[PDB]
Amino acid sequence: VSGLLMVLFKVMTDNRLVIVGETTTPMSNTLSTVVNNVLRTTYHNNVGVN
Amino acid sequence: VSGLLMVLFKVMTDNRLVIVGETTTPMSNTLSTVVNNVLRTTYHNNVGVN
Amino acid sequence: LSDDFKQISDPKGYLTYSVKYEDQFTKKDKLRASEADDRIVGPTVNLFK
Description:
Chains A, B: It comes from Bombyx mori cytoplasmic polyhedrosis virus. The structure is cut from a larger assembly and holds 3 copies of chain A. Chain A is α+β, with helices and mostly antiparallel strands. The first copy, chain A, has 1 helix and 1 strand, in the order αβ. The radius of gyration of chain A is 18 Å and the shape is elongated. The two termini of chain A are 32 Å apart. The A-C interface holds A 11, 15-19, 21-22, 26-27, 30-32, 35, 38-39, 43, 46-50 and C 4-11, 14, 17, 33-37, 39-44, 47.
């Protein structure tokens, strides 16, 4: 009950700004027609799990 | 006439069972539209002459 | 300047994923794709082995 109160403290005193970094763009010739439509134009460099 | 009789002996006393081994699957993005339709879904590992 | 908040390259997030593998369930088909077919959908494949 004290730890769940403390996890609520850290999320409240947050202060972070996201900065676009590393980003790369792939070509239409080098993607499957199923993964091509998912990408808008430019995926953020690094990779995500989903 | 004796060798052609002997080649008929070996084919008669045969006993072998084919086992699926090594098989790999390619992607649609990595094949020509002419070689793509030939492959059903999964080509047997190793390669064939035809 | 005051500088209240500091900036970062990549965001973290509060909710993450966990897994318990079974080291006896392996498929005998080593599949393959392109390099840009790999990058975008890459680490997500190795979290759901």
